Amino acid sequence: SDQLLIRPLGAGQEVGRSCIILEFKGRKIMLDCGIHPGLEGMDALPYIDLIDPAEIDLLLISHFHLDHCGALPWFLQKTSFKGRTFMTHATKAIYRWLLSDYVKVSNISADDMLYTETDLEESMDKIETINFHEVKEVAGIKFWCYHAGHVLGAAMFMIEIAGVKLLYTGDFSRQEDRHLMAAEIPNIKPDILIIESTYGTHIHEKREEREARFCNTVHDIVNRGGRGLIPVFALGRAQELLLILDEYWQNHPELHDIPIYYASSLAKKCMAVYQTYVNAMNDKIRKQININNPFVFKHISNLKSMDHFDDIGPSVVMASPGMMQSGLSRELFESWCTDKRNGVIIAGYCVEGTLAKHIMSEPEEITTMSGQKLPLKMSVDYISFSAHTDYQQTSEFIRALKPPHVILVHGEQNEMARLKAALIREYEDNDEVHIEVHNPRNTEAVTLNFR
Ligand SMILES: CN1CCN(CCOc2c(Cl)cc(C(=O)N[C@@H](Cc3ccccc3)C(=O)O)c(O)c2Cl)CC1
Ligand SMILES: [Zn+2]
Ligand SMILES: [Zn+2]
Numbered sequence: 001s002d003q004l005l006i007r008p009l010g011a012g013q014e015v016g017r018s019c020i021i022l023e024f025k026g027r028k029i030m031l032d033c034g035i036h037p038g039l040e041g042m043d044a045l046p047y048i049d050l051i052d053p054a055e056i057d058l059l060l061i062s063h064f065h066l067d068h069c070g071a072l073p074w075f076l077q078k079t080s081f082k083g084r085t086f087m088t089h090a091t092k093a094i095y096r097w098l099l100s101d102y103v104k105v106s107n108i109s110a111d112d113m114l115y116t117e118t119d120l121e122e123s124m125d126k127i128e129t130i131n132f133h134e135v136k137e138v139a140g141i142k143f144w145c146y147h148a149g150h151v152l153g154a155a156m157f158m159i160e161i162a163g164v165k166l167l168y169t170g171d172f173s174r175q176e177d178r179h180l181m182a183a184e185i186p187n188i189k190p191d192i193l194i195i196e197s198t199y200g201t202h203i204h205e206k207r208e209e210r211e212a213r214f215c216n217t218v219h220d221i222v223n224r225g226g227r228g229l230i231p232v233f234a235l236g237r238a239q240e241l242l243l244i245l246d247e248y249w250q251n252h253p254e255l256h257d258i259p260i261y262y263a264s265s266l267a268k269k270c271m272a273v274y275q276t277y278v279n280a281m282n283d284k285i286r287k288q289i290n291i292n293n294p295f296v297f298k299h300i301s302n303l304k305s306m307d308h309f310d311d312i313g314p315s316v317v318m319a320s321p322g323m324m325q326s327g328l329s330r331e332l333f334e335s336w337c338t339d340k341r342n343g344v345i346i347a348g349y350c351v352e353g354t355l356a357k358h359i360m361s362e363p364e365e366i367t368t369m370s371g372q373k374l375p376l377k378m379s380v381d382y383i384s385f386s387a388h389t390d391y392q393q394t395s396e397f398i399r400a401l402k403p404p405h406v407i408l409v410h411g412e413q414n415e416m417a418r419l420k421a422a423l424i425r426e427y428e429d430n431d432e433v434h435i436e437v438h439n440p441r442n443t444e445a446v447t448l449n450f451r
Helices: 072-077 089-105 117-126 207-223 238-251 267-276 283-288 327-336 355-361 391-401 413-428
Strands: 002-010 019-024 027-031 058-060 084-088 127-130 136-138 141-147 155-161 164-168 192-196 228-231 260-263 300-303 316-319 343-346 365-367 373-375 379-382 405-409 436-438 446-450
Touching (some): 019 164, 084 089, 089 117, 089 127, 117 127, 127 141, 207 343, 228 327, 238 260, 238 300, 267 300, 355 365, 413 436
Parallel strands (some): 027 058, 058 084, 084 127, 260 300, 343 379, 405 436
Antiparallel strands (some): 002 019, 002 446, 136 141, 155 164, 365 373
16 A cells, blocks of 8 residues: 655745645655745745655646745756756746746845846746646656636646556645636545645625725725835736726726826736737637737836836825835835825735735834834735635535545645644535545654555
8 A cells, every 4th residue: 555645845834935845756846936025035845855856756836926936947957957848838938027027026145035037037947837738747756737727727636646646736726716717526526635725714706896895995096195105026826906997997087187007027928928828718708809908008007117107196006026025116105104194005915924914913113124114004904815715615616526635735834734623524424425634743744555
């Protein structure tokens, strides 16, 4: 009876630096390779010191988000890793520009930096692309992927080694939004399921209500003579927000005086690359792209930097990064926090150790990048558009697949415990169904015996 080993080097009882080691029949597989946004230097990396890079046969990347691929240029260029790397086409294309904005936004010189834009550029040739619903075989390992929804190109990988099927969700959503599909429920049933836990103890409101709340907050800020800050990286959930705002400005002629800026040095390139992968979007937006392209915004202007910005009267700025560690969104927050008329809207999952996470604990004051202290008077709102499955969607996914083993990753420690308990209760009195739920810490291993 062969022994299957699953070990989180990252995202074990936390959100950040997703990296999961899978060991079975003389094969070593790594799932994702992200950084931790709430940490600095070598500490922001997964616990890579616990493995030998040269022994990794396969490296699979779920989606282009920094907490899943941010460490990838360091692992590909600055380690003994000689294995093969796979991404979907849209993920590889977006990976090149989000990481370029990331290195730009970053506040350190080449000495302290994990990698450069040249390392990122060079890492590209080392990455192979896979289509959805297509089998690839590497070192005896058979793999294919499903749609994850969540972000453009996001995949759920199914891995088969000697009759043993394992499904890794990456990050996923089971609802369609304006341009993305929902995640697929595989019909092939896995022995092991590795699933994200981000919003697993919560229940989503209607898309219509979240969109209305968001738009009403923005409108309320500009009405009172304020400027709206919406921190986001140029590629990710930002594309959904741009679609919502552009539609809202069309429906409200009394806002045609108020400008909307999508502020990023790479703004034009980001949108051009995004639009190249329309084939990976919803059926709705795929049919309408040649009728009226909604990605060709009527009310949103690009903005390269603070230098190209006339901060005269109310405006709405979408600026990188999302967690406001440094860069344009941090610069604008420092210029706008002291006026009570201004407002910040946080739309993503904020990780401990970031300004975005900090400002939600309602501080009296904040620290600038220069080191100074400023009073926090501007409003701070949290309206999530992070596109993660809620309890009903997680439960429904587990119930359709009924895998003997469920492994929780990518979630706050205490909420992951609560999710585990609820999944255990769901199958406690069921005699015909048997499911074992695990929630390992970083460096802890899940050991399973097969055959
Ligand atoms: C080793 N160090 C180097 C220095 N860095 C600074 C850059 O840190 C980051 C990182 Cl790594 C990732 C994100 C991110 O994934 N962001 C998404 C989602 C989102 C979140 C919140 C709100 C809205 C959206 C988006 O912007 O789409 C981010 O925002 C910041 Cl600030 C830390 C690691
Ligand atoms: Zn994600
Ligand atoms: Zn994630």
